[PDB]
Amino acid sequence: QWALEDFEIGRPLGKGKFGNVYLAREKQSKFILALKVLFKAQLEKAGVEHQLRREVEIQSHLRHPNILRLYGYFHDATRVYLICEYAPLGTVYRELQKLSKFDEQRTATYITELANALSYCHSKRVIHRDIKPENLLLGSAGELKIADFGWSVGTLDYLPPEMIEGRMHDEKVDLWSLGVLCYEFLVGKPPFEANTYQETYKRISRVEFTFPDFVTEGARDLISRLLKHNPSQRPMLREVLEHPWITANSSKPSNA
Numbered sequence: 001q002w003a004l005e006d007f008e009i010g011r012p013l014g015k016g017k018f019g020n021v022y023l024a025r026e027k028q029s030k031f032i033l034a035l036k037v038l039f040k041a042q043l044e045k046a047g048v049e050h051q052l053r054r055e056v057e058i059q060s061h062l063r064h065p066n067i068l069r070l071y072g073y074f075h076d077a078t079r080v081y082l083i084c085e086y087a088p089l090g091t092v093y094r095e096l097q098k099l100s101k102f103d104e105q106r107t108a109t110y111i112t113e114l115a116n117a118l119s120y121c122h123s124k125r126v127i128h129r130d131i132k133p134e135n136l137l138l139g140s141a142g143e144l145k146i147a148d149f150g151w152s153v154g155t156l157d158y159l160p161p162e163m164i165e166g167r168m169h170d171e172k173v174d175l176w177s178l179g180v181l182c183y184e185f186l187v188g189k190p191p192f193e194a195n196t197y198q199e200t201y202k203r204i205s206r207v208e209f210t211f212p213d214f215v216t217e218g219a220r221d222l223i224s225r226l227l228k229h230n231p232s233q234r235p236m237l238r239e240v241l242e243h244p245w246i247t248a249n250s251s252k253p254s255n256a
Ligand SMILES: Cc1cc(NC(=O)CCC(=O)c2ccc(F)c(C(F)(F)F)c2)ccc1-c1nn(C(C)C)c2ncnc(N)c12
Pocket: 013, 014, 015, 018, 021, 034, 036, 038, 043, 048, 049, 051, 052, 053, 055, 068, 082, 084, 085, 086, 087, 088, 090, 091, 134, 135, 137, 147, 148, 149, 150
């Protein structure tokens, strides 16, 4: 029992491939939220309508302060609407390009929030695909939120080798994801960035990257342990949260 006339639409927060995201206020309650608009024909011409459905299905069952809330959804004749938690402080992507790179304390805190969220997802038998900084939003107290759905049960920069090599993948993709982001947070660009898709593919498959001099031994150690070609050599999240560099630098308590 939901419709577009139920919401006052504010400014565009952002414009995406399959549609746009708007600030919105629910009329009866005055609840401020983010309304994401998707056009059916687009999703269909891309054949991802079913996948969207599955991801939204899995999202509904996810309650965690570091995961964007999905309040509900509906559709008219031509569009699909996702009613989402409004994240007032924008994306990590935008923060990174304003600050150039993050210090070790912001980085370890962000990694901790992600590991906690992912750890909660793992317990619910949920794993995440690609994790990109444009898909990490910031709450009012600047807490990080995983904002893209899917959730299992484009640029290659954030894909693990097993995914680009066409091998079997599991929850270990999440550990790779933390490794890539930890590096990007500290350095200001992901560790396999390149001018072409072709070069990036090679560099990921090879795990061919280097650290700038300013990256500390503690951070190199964590990143080197996450970015293992063999998914089975990657640590458990439980061990990311107890890493001495994480422990020494992060403001956020581990797990729960
Ligand atoms: C980043 C962000 C994400 C989301 N949720 C999604 O995007 C889920 C959709 C999805 O995963 C999907 C879509 C199509 C598709 F085909 C498939 C497939 F094929 F895989 F099935 C999957 C809602 C709001 C925002 C958001 N963005 N922003 C910026 C504009 C600052 C914001 N500023 C403030 N508050 C905000 N909430 C936001």
